[PDB]
DNA sequence: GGGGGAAGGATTC
DNA sequence: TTTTGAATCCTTCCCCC
């Protein structure tokens, strides 16, 4: 099987370019303003003249106009960021049947059935960065491999504006060179609980024994690496249904008055709903992120779809739960939708 | 012993 | 004054046959 990932390069802020121009060359950085003070919040993402200098994704948007001052700053618009990603990813279904939407910025192609070697393999990731710089001028950065893992790893190396291969023999080679911690899935905790067991590359998951593995991070990591060092990883191409939808916003001021929380829960769930469009979720979550960042949560479900006015009813009851069960302060409240009709 | 759903956990977009 | 926000799939816990 021969994978295609195609990932867009710093997509936000290159949507922005391309409604905007004169932006390019320009160190670009959207945000995410919370509106606790002047310039609260972090940064979404920053094209890569802004990355030169230590400005990414994560860092407060204070600390990132220390470094660049004078850089133009724009507030997040997922709307829009969304409507371009929806055509491109339209654009990209006339290459394959068997397409997997990732994100909002990545998707895996199965073009076993389409080609037969990486050549023309990635020819056809060539066909498909082109198409897309032309339908909406955005580059993008394309992965190909024999599974989805080392395809995502191909683009990994490669971005931006690239594109890259990773034969079988290379394949072999990662598994014993490659960082483990820069394999997908394997975030900070987990590189950590691992690039302490002796396991810096994934071929030593091999020589551990497997319950000690599966003791530190759990069955399924466990296997998934093994699976990956013994060569035999091969998810398949599937489509993904969104399975939840919310909205957690920042209040003004941390706070556990039930009334002075109310707002902001039922704004989450004003915009959750406007987002669920049409799905109809019998779950409902109550998501409360407390003063020293923990995430508290308390969620029913219902025999039948909720109504809005249910929503709101039970989310107090949730809130109420937490209220009770937690004696920290709230700084983040929201709400969570699942188990569509 | 293990199916199955609630709450926290972590990853990563 | 970090510190943002959304959605997932993983583990862990208790209920229940
Ligand atoms: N709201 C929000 N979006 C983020 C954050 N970090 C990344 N994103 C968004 C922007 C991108 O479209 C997508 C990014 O994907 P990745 O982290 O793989 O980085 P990559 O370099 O592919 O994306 P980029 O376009 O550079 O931001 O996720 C964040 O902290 N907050
Ligand atoms: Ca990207
Ligand atoms: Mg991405
Ligand atoms: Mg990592």
Partial sequence: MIVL????????????????????????????????????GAVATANYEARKFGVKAGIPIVEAKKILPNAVYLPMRKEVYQQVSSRIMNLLREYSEKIEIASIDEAYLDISDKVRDYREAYNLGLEIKNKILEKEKITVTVGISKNKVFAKIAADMAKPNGIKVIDDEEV????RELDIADVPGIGNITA????????????????????????????????????????????????????????????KRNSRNLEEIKPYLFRAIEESYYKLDKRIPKAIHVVAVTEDLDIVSRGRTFPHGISKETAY??????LQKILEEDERKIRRIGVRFSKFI
């Fill in 172 to 175: 072999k080679r990662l598994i």
């Fill in 5 to 40: 990932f195609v990932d867009f390069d710093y997509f936000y802020a290159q949507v922005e370019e391309v409604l905007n121009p004169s932006l390019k060359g320009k160190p670009v950085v959207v945000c995410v303003f919370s509106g606790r003070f002047e310039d609260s």
């Fill in 313 to 318: 009813s039970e989310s107090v009851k949730l």
């Fill in 192 to 251: 950590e609980k691992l690039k302490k067991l002796g396991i810096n590359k994934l071929v030593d998951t091999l020589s551990i024994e497997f319950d000690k593995l599966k003791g530190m991070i759990g069955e399924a990591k466990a296997k998934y690496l093994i699976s990956l060092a013994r060569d035999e990883y091969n998810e398949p191409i599937r489509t993904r249904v969104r399975k939840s939808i919310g909205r957690i916003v920042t209040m």
